Amino acid sequence: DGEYFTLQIRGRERFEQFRERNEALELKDAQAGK
Amino acid sequence: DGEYFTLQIRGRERFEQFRERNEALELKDAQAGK
């Protein structure tokens, strides 16, 4: 098993920022990070 | 009723970025936006 987190938003104008960021940040950790 | 969105992440280093952003972006729309 393991643990994680989850965020919810009711605005599409803001989501576009997180979603797109999710991909960018996803690479930040998946690659190096230390 | 209505509609919204939800994002999930399994990394704390990245979440800190979205979470903190969630508050910042939340104000972007909640205030003006057009």
From Swiss-Prot, chains A, B:
Q: How is it modified after translation?
A: Deacetylation by SIRT2 impairs its ability to induce transcription activation in a AKT-dependent manner.
Q: What is the effect of changing residue 1 to S?
A: In a sporadic cancer; somatic mutation; requires 2 nucleotide substitutions
Impact noted for substituting residue 14 to H: In LFS; germline mutation and in sporadic cancers; somatic mutation; impaired ability to tetramerize and undergo liquid-liquid phase separation
Compartment(s): Cytoplasm; Nucleus; Nucleus, PML body; Endoplasmic reticulum
Q: Outcome of mutating residue 20 to G, per the record?
A: In sporadic cancers; somatic mutation
Kindly summarize what the UniProt induction comment says about this protein's expression.
Answer: Up-regulated in response to DNA damage. Isoform 2 is not induced in tumor cells in response to stress.
Q: Which family does it belong to?
A: Belongs to the p53 family.
This protein is called Cellular tumor antigen p53
Query: What organism is recorded for this protein?
Result: Homo sapiens
What fragment of the full-length protein is this? Answer: 324 to 357 of 393
